[PDB]
Every structure is written in C-alpha cells, then in structure tokens.
C-alpha cells in the first residue's frame, strides 16, 4: 500500500513523475563528457 | 506609543500621582468630591427647535 501521506489528502493519487517532455534525448555519460569539455573551455 | 500599549508593549509601571496608601485615599476622596462638584455644575447649567 501507499506508506506515506499526501498533504491535500487525495490518497488515491498515483506516485506522479516529473514533467520532463525532453526525456531520452541525452545519455548520462554524454552529458558528463560535455560537462568536462565545457568546464575546460571555460 | 508602541512601548506604552500593544503587542510590542514593554510598559510595566504606571505613572502615579500618589506614593502612599494614605495619599491614595486622599486622592480618591478629593477626586470624588471634585467629580460630584462638576456634575452639580453641569446639572445646574424631545429635541429643541432649530
């Protein structure tokens, strides 16, 4: 069952996820490599 | 005015015209006599027409 409380009291509400419509466009490793390159260039 | 009365008030000692119990009794007696004199003066001194 749902183990925590919701503030508004709508206990039937699902565990919602973040509204990220730009998901899946970048892998994690590529972003880390771009972070290192941006830091070096800066 | 904020330190005299209110939520931020810090006043704790009143400003008195008397120091002793006997002085307070005399002050009360004189104030009552003056009050009665003033109401007698006002009493001696349907709506009225314009």
């Amino acid at each position: 069952k749902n183990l925590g409380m919701r503030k508004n009291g709508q206990v039937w509400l699902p565990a919602k996820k973040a509204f990220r419509p730009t998901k899946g466009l970048t892998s994690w490793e590529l972003r880390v490599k771009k972070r290192q390159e941006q830091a070096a260039m800066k | 005015f904020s330190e005299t009365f209110g939520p931020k008030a810090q006043r704790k000692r009143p400003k008195l015209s008397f120091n002793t119990v006997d002085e307070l009794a005399g002050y009360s007696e004189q104030s009552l006599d003056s009050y009665h004199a003033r109401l007698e003066e006002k009493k001696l001194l349907s709506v009225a027409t314009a």
């Binding site: 069952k1 749902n2 183990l3 925590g4 409380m5 | -």
Partner: protein, 245 residues
Amino acid sequence: PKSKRARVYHLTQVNKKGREAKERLFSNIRETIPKYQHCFVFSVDNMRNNYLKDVRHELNDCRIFFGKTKLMARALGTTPEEEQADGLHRLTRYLTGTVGLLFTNRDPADIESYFSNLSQVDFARAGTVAPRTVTVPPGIVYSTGGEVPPEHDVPVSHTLEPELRRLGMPVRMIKGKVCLGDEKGEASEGYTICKEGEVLDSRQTRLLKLFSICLSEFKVSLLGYWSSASGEVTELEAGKTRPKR
C-alpha cells in the same frame, strides 16, 4: 514558461553544504584510517537513529561516521587500485542502504558484546509491523491514550486536536477537553490506531509518537569489520542475510 512555482528563499542562517562538506567527509575518513586497527560496518535500517549520539558519547575512544553511503564507500575505496589500505575494497561491498562506519582500537568481541546487549525501546516508523493492537478508549483523551491508567494521566493538550482530526481521530472540544464523542463517553467506540500484524503507515506512527507509544527497538546490527594487521574482512551474522553491493 511564465507559469512556474515560486521558489521560496529561506531567511535562515544555515545554508546548503555542497561539495565542501563532501570533501571534508573524504578528508576525515581518509585521515581516520591510519589511527585505528579495526573498521566495523554497522546497519540501522528503518530506524529513528537519535540514540546514535549516545552511542558516540559512550564510545569515546571510537570514531563513528554516519554520512552518505556512496561517499563513505568512495572514501574507503571501491576498487583495489583506489583503496587507502589493503582489504578496504573488500569492506566497501557491505555499504548499502543506511549504514555507518566505526573506527576502533578495541576488541571485536567487546564491540560485538556492546552492540548485542545494547537495546533501547524506540518509536516505530512507517513500514514496521504492529506488535499489538492500540485503541484509544472513548471519553476524555489523555496524553498516553490509555497506556497508563487514566487516573494517573494528565488530559491531552487542547492544541493537539486539529492535528488529531487531520490524522483521522474524530475528536472534539468539550469545555476545553479533547474527547471521543461525549465527555463521559457514549455514542462511539474506541479509536483503533493500529491492529496486530499490520504494516504501519506514517499516520499511525505519528499518532503513536504523539501518544508516546513505542512499538519498536533500537538495535544496531554489525555486518563485518576490516582489520589493519591481518588486512582482511571478517563477516558477522547479519552480513550473510543483508543484501550486498
């Protein structure tokens, strides 16, 4: 994106720690290692962990770290090419979930005896199974909710009843007193906070904490320990059972 949540800026003294706290934890763990022979890993799962300060005070000669699990694992060294001392990457496989490090000069048997006979009764958290059935009786509500006899209990505070109504207890104010139903007790049954053999949620555990009813225990389970002299990790009883990473 005009429609956005307004980020509240806190007008308080304490700010976010950041990367500097991580580096401080790395330095402290990497300096604690060459001073103690034994490094224990202990597990405290689904627990309040406010008696850990008392544990730190009692173990004066020991050093206890209770930081982030992955940061402590990186401090000790996950790979054999990264470990500060030999056998520490063997110890890092024990660090998952809510764990902690214990650097000590003492005997492992002494440490095991202390953490075995140590036991304090503590408030239950959400997820634990209720060991018994708790029911606040009808009538005037007291502070313990029927744990002590009602003649030895102060009535509960009048400021708690909106919280009780939020947590689902159908209380009401009668002449400055919090009551279930009537003041003498009628037209209602006792409020069952929890039943035996039932997973507790946070609402029930908050009610039990407000009524000072403790249904759990403070048990620290030692998983294993790395020794500097032998350069090896000895695994204890909970180490086999606990998931490994």
